[PDB]
Design an enzyme around this catalytic site. Structure first.
Site, PDB file in Angstrom:
ATOM      1  N   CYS A 183      70.676  68.160 109.793  1.00 53.42           N
ATOM      2  CA  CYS A 183      70.226  69.496 109.895  1.00 53.42           C
ATOM      3  C   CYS A 183      71.444  70.213 110.498  1.00 53.42           C
ATOM      4  O   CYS A 183      72.543  69.981 110.077  1.00 53.42           O
ATOM      5  CB  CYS A 183      68.970  69.560 110.717  1.00 53.42           C
ATOM      6  SG  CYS A 183      68.901  68.382 112.057  1.00 53.42           S
ATOM      7  N   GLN A 227      63.193  67.336 118.504  1.00 52.73           N
ATOM      8  CA  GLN A 227      63.611  68.299 119.543  1.00 52.73           C
ATOM      9  C   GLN A 227      62.468  68.991 120.228  1.00 52.73           C
ATOM     10  O   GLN A 227      62.686  69.561 121.262  1.00 52.73           O
ATOM     11  CB  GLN A 227      64.599  69.296 118.968  1.00 52.73           C
ATOM     12  CG  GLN A 227      66.018  68.732 118.991  1.00 52.73           C
ATOM     13  CD  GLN A 227      66.422  68.493 120.443  1.00 52.73           C
ATOM     14  OE1 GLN A 227      66.511  67.332 120.929  1.00 52.73           O
ATOM     15  NE2 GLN A 227      66.566  69.598 121.176  1.00 52.73           N
ATOM     16  N   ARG A 259      65.249  68.253 113.266  1.00 55.23           N
ATOM     17  CA  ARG A 259      64.611  68.119 111.943  1.00 55.23           C
ATOM     18  C   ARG A 259      64.924  66.772 111.265  1.00 55.23           C
ATOM     19  O   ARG A 259      64.067  66.177 110.641  1.00 55.23           O
ATOM     20  CB  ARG A 259      65.091  69.340 111.070  1.00 55.23           C
ATOM     21  CG  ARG A 259      64.414  70.653 111.554  1.00 55.23           C
ATOM     22  CD  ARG A 259      64.896  71.882 110.854  1.00 55.23           C
ATOM     23  NE  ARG A 259      66.235  72.258 111.370  1.00 55.23           N
ATOM     24  CZ  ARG A 259      66.893  73.349 110.992  1.00 55.23           C
ATOM     25  NH1 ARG A 259      66.286  74.188 110.085  1.00 55.23           N
ATOM     26  NH2 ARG A 259      68.124  73.631 111.522  1.00 55.23           N
ATOM     27  N   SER A 260      66.182  66.351 111.312  1.00 58.41           N
ATOM     28  CA  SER A 260      66.626  64.998 110.845  1.00 58.41           C
ATOM     29  C   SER A 260      65.774  63.921 111.497  1.00 58.41           C
ATOM     30  O   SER A 260      65.238  63.041 110.830  1.00 58.41           O
ATOM     31  CB  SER A 260      68.113  64.809 111.170  1.00 58.41           C
ATOM     32  OG  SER A 260      68.912  65.820 110.411  1.00 58.41           O
ATOM     33  N   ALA A 262      72.292  70.224 114.056  1.00 57.22           N
ATOM     34  CA  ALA A 262      72.780  69.194 114.979  1.00 57.22           C
ATOM     35  C   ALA A 262      72.574  67.756 114.496  1.00 57.22           C
ATOM     36  O   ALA A 262      73.145  66.890 115.017  1.00 57.22           O
ATOM     37  CB  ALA A 262      72.028  69.334 116.293  1.00 57.22           C
ATOM     38  N   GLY A 263      71.702  67.522 113.528  1.00 57.22           N
ATOM     39  CA  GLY A 263      71.356  66.136 113.029  1.00 57.22           C
ATOM     40  C   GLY A 263      70.430  65.378 113.943  1.00 57.22           C
ATOM     41  O   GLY A 263      70.567  64.157 114.113  1.00 57.22           O
ATOM     42  N   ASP A 295      64.749  76.221 112.306  1.00 55.53           N
ATOM     43  CA  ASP A 295      65.423  75.485 113.321  1.00 55.53           C
ATOM     44  C   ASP A 295      64.411  75.443 114.481  1.00 55.53           C
ATOM     45  O   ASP A 295      63.637  76.387 114.663  1.00 55.53           O
ATOM     46  CB  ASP A 295      66.723  76.205 113.682  1.00 55.53           C
ATOM     47  CG  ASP A 295      67.688  75.336 114.524  1.00 55.53           C
ATOM     48  OD1 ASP A 295      67.277  74.362 115.228  1.00 55.53           O
ATOM     49  OD2 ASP A 295      68.909  75.657 114.448  1.00 55.53           O
TER      50      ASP A 295
HETATM   51  O1  LIG Z   1      69.248  71.557 113.493  1.00 54.64           O
HETATM   52  C1  LIG Z   1      68.371  71.086 114.330  1.00 54.64           C
HETATM   53  O2  LIG Z   1      67.237  70.935 113.959  1.00 54.64           O
HETATM   54  C2  LIG Z   1      68.709  70.778 115.699  1.00 54.64           C
HETATM   55  O3  LIG Z   1      68.395  69.697 116.087  1.00 54.64           O
HETATM   56  N1  LIG Z   1      69.316  71.706 116.439  1.00 54.64           N
HETATM   57  C3  LIG Z   1      69.710  71.672 117.728  1.00 54.64           C
HETATM   58  C4  LIG Z   1      69.548  70.597 118.582  1.00 54.64           C
HETATM   59  C5  LIG Z   1      69.997  70.641 119.900  1.00 54.64           C
HETATM   60  C6  LIG Z   1      70.605  71.774 120.410  1.00 54.64           C
HETATM   61  C7  LIG Z   1      71.139  71.933 121.827  1.00 54.64           C
HETATM   62  C8  LIG Z   1      70.266  71.556 123.036  1.00 54.64           C
HETATM   63  C9  LIG Z   1      70.287  70.096 123.177  1.00 54.64           C
HETATM   64  N2  LIG Z   1      71.290  69.196 123.199  1.00 54.64           N
HETATM   65  C10 LIG Z   1      70.794  67.951 123.313  1.00 54.64           C
HETATM   66  C11 LIG Z   1      71.340  66.701 123.363  1.00 54.64           C
HETATM   67  C12 LIG Z   1      70.507  65.620 123.487  1.00 54.64           C
HETATM   68  C13 LIG Z   1      69.153  65.794 123.567  1.00 54.64           C
HETATM   69  C14 LIG Z   1      68.604  67.056 123.522  1.00 54.64           C
HETATM   70  C15 LIG Z   1      69.460  68.113 123.388  1.00 54.64           C
HETATM   71  O4  LIG Z   1      69.108  69.461 123.301  1.00 54.64           O
HETATM   72  S1  LIG Z   1      70.911  72.070 124.462  1.00 54.64           S
HETATM   73  O5  LIG Z   1      71.638  70.947 125.000  1.00 54.64           O
HETATM   74  O6  LIG Z   1      71.925  73.104 124.299  1.00 54.64           O
HETATM   75  N3  LIG Z   1      69.699  72.530 125.393  1.00 54.64           N
HETATM   76  C16 LIG Z   1      69.342  72.009 126.592  1.00 54.64           C
HETATM   77  C17 LIG Z   1      70.028  70.976 127.222  1.00 54.64           C
HETATM   78  C18 LIG Z   1      69.604  70.494 128.467  1.00 54.64           C
HETATM   79  C19 LIG Z   1      68.497  71.029 129.113  1.00 54.64           C
HETATM   80  F1  LIG Z   1      68.089  70.570 130.316  1.00 54.64           F
HETATM   81  C20 LIG Z   1      67.822  72.062 128.487  1.00 54.64           C
HETATM   82  C21 LIG Z   1      68.242  72.544 127.248  1.00 54.64           C
HETATM   83  C22 LIG Z   1      70.765  72.827 119.534  1.00 54.64           C
HETATM   84  C23 LIG Z   1      70.322  72.795 118.226  1.00 54.64           C
END
Ligand SMILES: O=C(O)C(=O)Nc1ccc(C[C@@H](c2nc3ccccc3o2)S(=O)(=O)Nc2ccc(F)cc2)cc1
Length: 298
Positions: A214, A261, A220-221, A216-217, A180
């Site tokens: 993945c 990501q 990795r997706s 969150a989709g 991840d």
């Molecule tokens: O399985 C994967 O590969 C996968 O993609 N996993 C995954 C993706 C995203 C997140 C969450 C984070 C996030 N959520 C967003 C939604 C849209 C775009 C990016 C994102 O990242 S967060 O929001 O919690 N972190 C954050 C938000 C704002 C900030 F300023 C700093 C940090 C957790 C797991």
């Protein structure tokens, strides 16, 4: 050559910044439906939502929400559905969507447990004799066989709509070694796997869009869709020079937020495109070398 671009970005150490500019330029549409309170427990992450305009709607009058998006890449003439890893309550929804959307392949890029956390429900049967029934969407799923390899597994599944009793074969491509927020071990293990998905026929236009997930989709997706579409576009025109990767990623982010990501995932995307390009421009034998370099046996 995006190769030239790749060396300059490396040479001057500036992926973080190039990736940040994609982020600030990316699209932003509403997700009203995803944010309805009746849908709270259908989302895995509070902050990962499908835009309303590109979401896949389930065909049931009950509640049509699912955290999935149709990435429709017009110029490349491929589509993908990206979705979060399903949840204990949304696995019926998941396979509803696969059925309604006539998907032939599901591509899973995560493990059910990562970093001590349950990142995806156990949404397909691990044993031929222990099939699954989804009461809510009236569907049955059964494991027909699997071919387990060192870093990825391919399952063949049978999905039955219990209403009509029609049955379909769903192929399931599970990459098991991709951390991840991480990157695969090399361009080669990645391409070997992408090519196995391609070779299956799952990505044909005779079929619904492949479902890619993945946790969150998006991370990795993202990475996997981006490379596939870039290869494909380069393949269509048989012209490396005219594929602009960042701009294709930006086109993708019009349909789903957050695709890719990390700056390293972006950099890896590039490596994977540059490497795949060899096959696409007529060095067939590079495919065999990926099988070797990847080490799919033991
Ligand atoms: O399985 C994967 O590969 C996968 O993609 N996993 C995954 C993706 C995203 C997140 C969450 C984070 C996030 N959520 C967003 C939604 C849209 C775009 C990016 C994102 O990242 S967060 O929001 O919690 N972190 C954050 C938000 C704002 C900030 F300023 C700093 C940090 C957790 C797991």
């Amino acid at each position: 050559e995006m190769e030239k671009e790749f060396e300059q970005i490396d040479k001057s150490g500036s992926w973080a910044a190039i990736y940040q500019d994609i982020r600030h330029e990316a699209s932003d549409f509403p997700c009203r439906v995803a944010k309805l309170p009746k849908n709270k427990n259908r989302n895995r992450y509070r902050d990962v939502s499908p835009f309303d305009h590109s979401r896949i709607k389930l065909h049931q009058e009950d509640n049509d929400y699912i955290n999935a998006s149709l990435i429709k890449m017009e110029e490349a003439q491929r589509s993908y559905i990206l979705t979060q890893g399903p949840l204990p309550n949304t696995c019926g929804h998941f396979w509803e969507m696969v059925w309604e959307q006539k998907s032939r392949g599901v591509v899973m890029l995560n493990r059910v447990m990562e970093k001590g956390s349950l990142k995806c429900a156990q949404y397909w049967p691990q044993k031929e004799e222990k099939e699954m029934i989804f009461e809510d969407t009236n569907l049955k799923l059964t494991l027909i066989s699997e071919d387990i390899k060192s870093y990825y597994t391919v399952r063949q599944l049978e999905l039955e709509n219990l209403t009509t009793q029609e049955t379909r074969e769903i192929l399931h491509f599970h990459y098991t070694t991709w951390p991840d927020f991480g990157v695969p071990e090399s361009p080669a293990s990645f391409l070997n796997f992408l090519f196995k998905v391609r070779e299956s026929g799952s990505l044909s236009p005779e079929h619904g869009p492949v479902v890619v997930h993945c946790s969150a989709g998006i991370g990795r997706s993202g990475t996997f869709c981006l490379a596939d579409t870039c290869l494909l576009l380069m393949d269509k025109r048989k012209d490396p020079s005219s594929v602009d990767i960042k701009k294709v990623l930006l086109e993708m982010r019009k349909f789903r937020m957050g695709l890719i990501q990390t700056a390293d995932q972006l950099r890896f995307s590039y490596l994977a495109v540059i490497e795949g390009a060899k096959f696409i421009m007529g060095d067939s034998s590079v495919q065999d070398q990926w099988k070797e370099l990847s080490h799919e046996d033991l």
